[PDB]
Design a protein around this ligand. Sequence first.
Ligand SMILES: Nc1ncnc2c1ncn2[C@@H]1O[C@H](CSCC[C@H](N)C(=O)O)[C@@H](O)[C@H]1O
Length: 260
Amino acid sequence: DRIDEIERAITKSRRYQTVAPATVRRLARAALVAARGDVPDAVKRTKRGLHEIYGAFLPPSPPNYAALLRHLDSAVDAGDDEAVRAALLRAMSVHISTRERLPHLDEFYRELFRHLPRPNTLRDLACGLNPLAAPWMGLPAETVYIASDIDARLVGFVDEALTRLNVPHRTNVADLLEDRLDEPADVTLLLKTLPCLETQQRGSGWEVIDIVNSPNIVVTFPTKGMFQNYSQSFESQARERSCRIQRLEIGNELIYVIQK
Ligand SMILES: Nc1ncnc2c1ncn2[C@@H]1O[C@H](CSCC[C@H](N)C(=O)O)[C@@H](O)[C@H]1O
């Protein structure tokens, strides 16, 4: 019952009302045991935990997605590609992490896909608002975009955006530390996610990379001794598994293209 109680408080009007029930329950269980059974403290622990992995990237209250979609529609309707891209850039900027890549979006994907095969199915885990980029990805017309994150409204908005861009897609609310990763996908994107997973569960980072059913994985780390920290640990861990990888650095992002 104590977990249900915590969750009820975590339906946290504003910030965490639509976070994946699976994520709330996982955090609440760890928080309860760590809080010595004190629900009030368990609630604070969970809330704080949610801010670390989710809340920190988004607004104090849910973003105004309706307005973001409205602008998207006007552009798509007016058949103005410039307007569509402008509306997409504006939307993606609501998510703090995704916002950091916008200045290097074209270089980022132009280069990234030169090191990848032409995908039939692109999976974007802990996607943030990244899927809204794509017109920049030069994806094959038939490519199916599979995106997921930890918030239903964010993911639900990613779905509407992809629908307006007429991009074949499927979207789900999935927690990388529990949900399945066996669905086949030619390429999987794990952009600026590992650090967050490691914080939630030590070692989870590479456990995900290993089980993800994709022969091609792109793992990135934010750069803004952050580059040193991330490049050293990841690279030692890779050479420790004889993983074939190609390193790149675009904008404030350290990129690793993993094959097999
Ligand atoms: N356990 C978990 N499972 C899936 N996504 C998670 C997660 N914990 C955190 N996230 C998500 O991790 C993302 C990190 S920020 C990076 C967002 C996006 N990948 C981009 O590159 O721009 C957030 O969107 C957050 O909601």
